[PDB]
Ligand SMILES: OC[C@@H]1O[C@@H](O[C@@H]2[C@@H](O)[C@H](O[C@@H]3CO[C@@H](O)[C@H](O)[C@H]3O)OC[C@H]2O[C@@H]2OC[C@@H](O)[C@H](O)[C@H]2O)[C@H](O)[C@H]1O
Ligand SMILES: OC[C@@H]1O[C@@H](O[C@@H]2[C@@H](O)[C@H](O[C@@H]3CO[C@@H](O)[C@H](O)[C@H]3O)OC[C@H]2O[C@@H]2OC[C@@H](O)[C@H](O)[C@H]2O)[C@H](O)[C@H]1O
Ligand SMILES: OC[C@@H]1O[C@@H](O[C@@H]2[C@@H](O)[C@H](O[C@@H]3CO[C@@H](O)[C@H](O)[C@H]3O)OC[C@H]2O[C@@H]2OC[C@@H](O)[C@H](O)[C@H]2O)[C@H](O)[C@H]1O
Ligand SMILES: O[C@@H]1[C@@H](O)[C@H](O[C@@H]2CO[C@@H](O[C@@H]3CO[C@@H](O)[C@H](O)[C@H]3O)[C@H](O)[C@H]2O)OC[C@H]1O
Ligand SMILES: O[C@@H]1[C@@H](O)[C@H](O[C@@H]2CO[C@@H](O)[C@H](O)[C@H]2O)OC[C@H]1O
Ligand SMILES: O[C@@H]1[C@@H](O)[C@H](O[C@@H]2CO[C@@H](O)[C@H](O)[C@H]2O)OC[C@H]1O
């Protein structure tokens with residue numbers, strides 16, 4: 068099993084990317100993670116219209132090239148984002164309408180694609196052209212007001228500018244098949260392929276939250292578009308709350324569709340997210356891997372032979388044969404856990420939540436009051452701290468999100484009463500656990 | 504007399520205060536909460552040694568008076584903090600020692616107490632004089648090196664300076680009766696009382712976290728000190744994770760001790776906390792009341808006519824007589840909840856967690872998809888968002904922490920299938936619920 072997201076995705080011929088902010092490239096913590104985990108890069112803002120053509124006819128690639136150079140220097144391919152869009156247009160373009168705007172859109176596409184000709188894997192040629200009003204029609208923007216054919220023209224222009232690039236139509240809230248927006252986009256792409264309009268891919272931003280949640284029918288949405296003869300890609304994935312299950316579900320949906328090129332999450336650490344308040348990414352502020360990170364990696368690697376114990380379940384250490392147990396079924400916060408002969412008792416029934424907690428009694432959480440070796444593993448009221456979050460590695464070890472240390476049976480102890488602590492992972496049998 | 508913390512505490516002759524920072528008195532969001540909820544104030548830093556005597560012999564009460572004046576002008580008593588302490592001493596005092604330091608200690612006490620003579624309810628004369636090494640002995644500081652009798656001298660000095668003030672000894676990690684530190688202080692206070700050393704109160708900072716967790720024996724500690732003939736006060740309360748149950752437990756501990764003067768939480772909003780990372784207070788950064796706030800208010804008002812449920816239970820609407828139900832026992836995120844004839848089934852069994860969540864199926868959370876009127880209430884993977892946190896008001900309403908809006912049966916419907924939404928609280932029967 069591969070150890071990084073990019074490498075794991077490549078095992079299925081896919082990529083796993085992120086959105087890079089040029090202003091954060093001087094941050095070693097940021098680049099260490101980004102260079103290691105991803106093999107595809109999208110500039111978060113540097114290749115947008117206002118950034119690449121500040122004045123009409125005057126192109127500027129200083130910001131975009133800093134991102135591009137970093138990507139190629141670190142072995143990543145690049146998704147160009149984005150050529151024609153109603154948002155983040157420079158002031159001079161916002162002032163345009165009709166034929167003048169139409170030609171400006173064309174000139175912009177030619178200028179930017181010409182600069183990056185042959186260096187971009189995919190280009191989001193058109194971004195967010197459909198409305199959210201439920202009509203399934205076009206968003207009202209200066210671009211749409213130039214004529215309904217503006218999208219078609221953008222794609223024909225892009226194809227000629229750089230025939231080596233895959234041309235994508237990108238949008239959000241088009242993941243759930245039942246939505247009118249989703250179906251409006253489907254009809255357009257269908258029409259395009261039918262009439263020979265140059266379009267190679269459809270990007271599903273995949274910005275999921277309780278307002279617009281992930282729905283399992285997303286797999287059918289992907290299959291439907293793939294059937295039109297276009298590749299599909301998850302382009303700006305982030306999930307409010309970062310549910311391990313939801314992240315895994317999305318990953319498996321892409322892996323179930325042969326035409327799904329890969330997944331790009333919209334940012335590196337939650338603190339780098341445009342929606343940091345929703346802690347929707349795979350790494351938290353201090354750069355530690357979140358529970359969702361392990362869920363995605365495991366999914367990319369094919370998953371587990373047997374599905375995780377839905378609710379409840381004992382945690383037995385292979386090196387001892389005993390189960391993680393709370394001393395005398397105590398519910399007092401601060402009680403250090405231990406190993407003990409497995410048996411039908413709530414003080415041995417742990418539930419691994421989507422947030423990455425190991426709950427017992429329903430509202431008590433496996434807790435670590437420190438981050439250094441020797442830190443006692445205990446129980447404490449659940450509140451969501453990173454010191455109460457854990458990652459279930461495929462090798463059977465359980466790692467604390469905040470500390471990055473593995474659950475360890477003090478002194479390789481295997482007898483009953485053996486306390487549990489945090490310690491540098493070592494593949495030891497006293498650090499391996501079975502979800503029996 | 505019971506809609507705010509201070510007023511509710513006043514019903515039993517107690518107070519509920521906070522720590523004020525004068526630099527925030529210009530922030531309307533801050534003062535709106537502080538002036539309304541508390542009737543006792545402690546200066547977070549403005550009455551400390553360095554802030555009151557910047558240079559030896561040169562007192563400056565500018566900052567301290569700003570806090571004091573705001574307090575009295577807004578109807579709050581004041582706790583003076585703190586006269587003799589090893590920490591936050593001005594540079595000049597840190598380098599002092601021996602009899603030189605002793606005289607300075609006395610001069611400081613006289614200068615500060617003299618300035619506020621007759622205006623202060625309680626004074627933390629001495630702060631944190633005991634060690635955490637587990638020996639139960641004194642902390643090694645320049646103050647202790649001047650003679651083990653510095654504490655006694657400090658109190659005798661204080662008494663003379665202002666006999667109308669209650670003199671308290673303040674410290675942390677002295678809440679758990681089984682700790683050596685707690686015993687050391689207990690024995691000292693007992694000795695002081697027997698020898699006539701003028702001490703009127705013992706302040707328990709109450710900074711609880713998984714490192715030094717709250718324990719039910721805190722009540723015993725309070726009762727043991729009360730039995731010595733001294734008042735007790737919870738002076739700097741904050742709880743890592745802000746568990747609703749732990750906050751209510753501490754509140755009830757004070758109410759259980761006749762000598763417990765009141766409770767002070769160390770700050771207003773979590774963002775104002777010295778430990779914001781532990782989100783240990785009663786209000787969020789945006790100023791919204793947390794689950795714990797309602798738990799404290801309810802405890803102060805005498806709790807409920809019946810002991811709060813122990814997880815897993817139905818939530819029945821008063822107006823409809825029907826239960827909060829997840830349509831067809833679905834577990835898909837985004838499924839809006841409804842009313843339905845009550846029956847024994849997991850899709851009607853909700854657990855109120857200490858974090859303020861209403862969980863179903865174990866890892867699904869009652870979730871608000873927005874903050875305005877008409878916002879859909881559904882289930883979504885639990886992740887800790889404020890839109891998944893709720894307050895169980897004494898009048899039977901359930902208020903969303905983030906929105907400040909009430910769970911509401913759409914259109915006042917009462918029939919099976921009536922959907923649930925958020926809406927301005929109105930005291931309507933379609934917004935009232937019983938968990939019994
Ligand atoms: O707000 C700070 C800014 O947040 C991040 O930059 C965001 C982008 O992430 C955002 O991406 C779009 C998200 O919606 C998708 O549908 C769309 O396809 C994406 O392109 O776009 C807005 C951008 O904010 C601007 O960034 C540039 C800055 O000068 C502007 O003031 C911001 O409003 C970055 O993390 C951070 O810079
Ligand atoms: O700048 C951070 C500062 O944090 C908060 O101020 C804290 C006080 O809350 C803290 O109170 C003590 C906590 O421990 C108790 O045992 C003791 O009794 C309390 O008095 O004391 C430290 C103080 O920090 C200093 O504040 C002033 C600043 O100039 C210093 O650099 C800080 O170290 C406030 O929320 C915030 O201002
Ligand atoms: O009885 C007719 C019904 O009630 C009215 O709508 C009420 C509002 O008047 C009410 O206003 C709040 C009253 O308490 C104040 O403290 C608060 O500041 C006011 O905002 O809020 C509730 C609302 O009822 C909801 O209306 C929408 C419906 O879908 C919900 O089910 C109702 O609970 C109107 O006459 C009608 O709604
Ligand atoms: O999501 C809804 C389901 O929860 C709902 O379940 C039915 C609830 O009522 C059950 O019958 C009750 C048994 O107890 C008696 O006291 C009541 O009067 C009966 O109504 C019924 O067996 C359940 O299937 O069904 C509808 C779903 O939308
Ligand atoms: O910029 C775009 C946002 O405007 C968009 O907002 C969505 C609107 O519909 C709601 O149901 C969704 O919850 C909300 O996120 O999201 C995508 C983003 O690119
Ligand atoms: O206090 C001692 C612990 O620090 C010690 O920890 C062990 C260190 O080596 C690791 O390989 C072991 O897994 C870990 O338990 O154990 C003995 C105890 O007395």
Ligand SMILES: O[C@@H]1[C@@H](O)[C@H](O[C@@H]2CO[C@@H](O)[C@H](O)[C@H]2O)OC[C@H]1O
Nearest residue numbers: 635675676708710712713714715716
């Ligand atoms: O300033 C004081 C802190 O130094 C003190 O720190 C405590 C040390 O013991 C640990 O077990 C606790 O978790 C930790 O908070 O806390 C009180 C504070 O006033």
Ligand SMILES: O[C@@H]1[C@@H](O)[C@H](O)OC[C@H]1O
Nearest residue numbers: 392393394395396407414
């Ligand atoms: O926690 C242990 C309990 O599970 C077992 O049954 O008896 C011994 C205890 O220490």
